[PDB]
């Protein structure tokens, strides 16, 4: 009943992550046990681990805790009352979201409501890299009601959510403006960005010629606040980081502009859709580095720089 898993005993720097022997998750009669093949990293992982996030509030008196929500793998055990999944099925989805992060591990417990069948053409690494980043990109674009003709500014275009959002926005027929390092300019142009603003070189507002219909703000804080000034009268900002969502919405209200937060929800139909695109080479998931669980500290140090292009992923098997 043992497995290897990454845990942390205290909130702190990346060094607090440990590869630990731990029991296999318990599963209820309506849940399943999954042998994990792949699990991707998201910033929420390091914000929880350093204790800054809202999820850290709930785990405060409940450590040690695992980490990770995105996973890919094989169904090994099934509860008595699970009807539509079979043992041996290859699956992809989210586990333990939000209060029981657990995917940096060899086995996870999951509900059939938070997984789908992995398409055959998808690799396990691709399948584990998609759920959080992809569902967020899509639901942000939908919250902004992006249509063909619209101008869309996507901050942090080279990252996990961004690089997908750019591709999805291009496929919607929108003019895509984005912010990134000079180093990522060529990468983002190739994915469909019309303009890549080097945000180190000048105020990004100065680089934007005309009022924008939507801002997909993936940085938040003062960048999100600043983005309000480039919106059209009818434009809206979707500020995705949760910690400054309220602040950004308030300043938008004061500027008489529409603003939204975003809380990623699991959607079977959307993830089916995103996965199909990836299998048909119509949407690229950029996996910039593949780690073993043994390298979790290193992985988290890289992720916390805030300069990861695309996705980092653990190959568990
Ligand atoms: N509320 C929700 O349901 C969700 C919220 N999120 C949140 O959204 C945010 C982004 O997520 P994710 O895409 O995974 O993050 P990433 O770590 O993958 O994003 C890294 C990217 O950010 C860019 N970047 C860093 N600083 C700036 C800046 N000041 N201006 C413009 N770009 C910048 C970098 O570009 P470069 O190297 O070129 O400088 C890099 O490519 C996170 O804070 C995350 O917690 C994510 C998923 C769901």
The three-state (H, E, C) secondary structure of the chain, written as one string: CEEEEEEECCCCCHHHEEEEEEECCCCCCCCEEEEEEEEECCHHHHHHHCCCCHHHHHHCCCCCECCCCEEEEEEEEECCCCCCCCCCCEEEEECCCCCCCCCCECEEEECHHHEEECCCCCCHHHHHHCHHHHHHHHHHHHHCCCCCCCEEEECCCCCHHHHHHHHHHHHCCCEEEEEECHHHHHHHHHHCCCEEEECCCCCHHHHCCCCEEEEEECCCHHHHHHHHHHEEEEEEEEECCCCCHHHHHHHHHHCCCEEECCCCCCCHHHHHHHHHHHHCCCCCCCEEEEECHHHHHHHHHHHHCCCCCCEEEEECC
* Tokens of residue 21, six digits: 């022997």
Domain count, the chain: 2
CA nearest 241: which of 258, 257, 223, 220?
Answer: 220
* Tokens of residue 253, six digits: 């209200």
Q: Say how far residue 14 (Cα) sits from the centre of its chain.
A: 19
Whether residues 255 and 282 fall in one domain: no
Among 67, 101, 156, the mutation site with the greatest number of ligand 1 atoms within 8 A of its Cβ is 156
Among protein residues, the one whose CA lies closest to atom 12 of ligand 1: 160
Please report, for the domain that includes residue 245, its CATH number: 3.40.50.720
Residue 148 structural domain: 133-265
Cα torsion 121, 125, 128, 131 to 10°: value is -60
Whether residues 148 and 194 fall in one domain: yes
* Tokens of residue 260, six digits: 């939204």
Whether residues 127 and 113 fall in one domain: yes
Whether residues 279 and 232 fall in one domain: no
Experimental determination technique = X-ray
- HSE (CB half, 13 Å, CA atoms) of 259? 27
Handedness of CA 102, 106, 107, 108 (dihedral sign): positive
- Contact in structure between 137 and 153 (CB atoms under 8 Å): no
Please report, for the domain that includes residue 94, its CATH number: 3.90.180.10
Beta pairing partners, 239? 217
Q: In Å, how far are 36, 111, 126, 131, 249 from 93, measured between CA atoms?
A: 11, 10, 12, 6, 30
Whether residues 177 and 260 fall in one domain: yes
Residue where the block lists tokens 């859709």:
273
Residue where the block lists tokens 């100065």:
206
Instruction: Check whether 255 is labelled as a binding-site residue.
Output: no
Instruction: Give dist(CA 217, CA 237) in Å, integer.
Output: 7
Whether residues 206 and 240 fall in one domain: yes
Contacts of 54 (CB under 8 A, 6+ apart): 242, 243
Instruction: Give dist(CA 221, CA 149) in Å, integer.
Output: 28
Task: Count other Cβ atoms within 10 Å, centred on residue 6.
Answer: 27
Instruction: Give dist(CA 49, CA 66) in Å, integer.
Output: 9
Whether residues 109 and 15 fall in one domain: yes
Residue 82 alpha carbon to ligand 1 centre in Å: 37
Instruction: Check whether 248 is labelled as a binding-site residue.
Output: no
Whether residues 260 and 143 fall in one domain: yes
Whether residues 139 and 251 fall in one domain: yes
Q: Give residue ranges with CB within 6 A of ligand 1.
A: 42-44, 132-133, 136, 155-156, 158-162, 179-181, 184, 199, 218-219, 223, 240-242, 262-264, 306-309
Residue 76 alpha carbon to ligand 1 centre in Å: 34
Q: Give me Rg for the CA atoms of the chain.
A: 20
Among 159, 177, 311, 312, the mutation site with the greatest number of ligand 1 atoms within 8 A of its Cβ is 159
Tallying the residues shown for the chain, one arrives at: 317
End-of-domain residue from the set 243, 265, 287: 265
Beta pairing partners, 104? none
Whether residues 156 and 41 fall in one domain: no
Whether residues 246 and 147 fall in one domain: yes
Task: Count other Cβ atoms within 10 Å, centred on residue 89.
Answer: 17
Whether residues 19 and 125 fall in one domain: yes
Q: Say how far residue 133 (Cα) sits from the centre of its chain.
A: 3
| Parallel, antiparallel or unpaired: strands 311-315 and 287-291 | parallel
Contacts of 121 (CB under 8 A, 6+ apart): 279, 280
Instruction: Check whether 181 is labelled as a binding-site residue.
Output: yes
Instruction: Give dist(CA 194, CA 209) in Å, integer.
Output: 13
- Contact in structure between 129 and 311 (CB atoms under 8 Å): yes
């Amino acid at each position: 009943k043992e497995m290897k898993a990454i845990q942390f005993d205290q909130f702190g720097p990346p060094k607090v992550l440990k590869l630990v022997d731990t029991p296999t998750p318990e599963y209820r009669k309506n849940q399943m046990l999954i042998k994990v093949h792949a699990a991707s990293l998201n910033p929420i992982d390091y914000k929880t681990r350093n204790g800054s996030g809202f999820v850290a509030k709930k785990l405060k008196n409940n450590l040690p805790s695992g980490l990770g929500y995105d996973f890919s793998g094989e169904v090994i055990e099934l509860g008595s009352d699970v009807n539509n999944v079979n043992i041996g099925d290859k699956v992809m989805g989210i586990a333990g979201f939000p209060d029981h992060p657990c995917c940096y591990a060899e086995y996870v417990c999951a509900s059939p409501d938070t997984i789908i069948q992995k398409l055959e053409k998808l690799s396990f690494l691709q399948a584990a890299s998609l759920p959080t980043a992809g569902l967020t990109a899509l639901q942000a674009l939908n919250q902004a009601e992006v249509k063909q003709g619209d101008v869309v500014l996507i901050h942090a275009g080279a990252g996990g959510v961004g690089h997908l959002a750019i591709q999805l926005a291009k496929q919607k027929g929108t003019t895509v403006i984005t912010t990134a390092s000079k180093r990522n300019h060529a990468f983002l142009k190739a994915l469909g960005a019309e303009q890549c603003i080097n945000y180190h070189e000048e105020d990004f507002l100065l680089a934007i010629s005309t009022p924008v219909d939507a801002v997909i703000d993936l940085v938040g804080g003062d960048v999100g606040i600043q983005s309000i000034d480039c919106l059209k009268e009818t434009g809206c900002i979707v500020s995705v980081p949760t910690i400054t969502a309220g602040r950004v919405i308030e300043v938008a209200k004061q500027k008489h502009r529409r603003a939204f937060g975003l809380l990623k929800q699991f959607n079977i139909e959307e993830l089916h859709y995103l996965g199909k695109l990836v299998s048909e080479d119509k949407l690229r998931i950029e996996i910039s580095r593949i780690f073993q669980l043994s390298e979790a500290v290193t992985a988290h140090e890289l992720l916390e720089t805030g300069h990861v292009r695309g996705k980092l992923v653990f190959k568990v098997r």
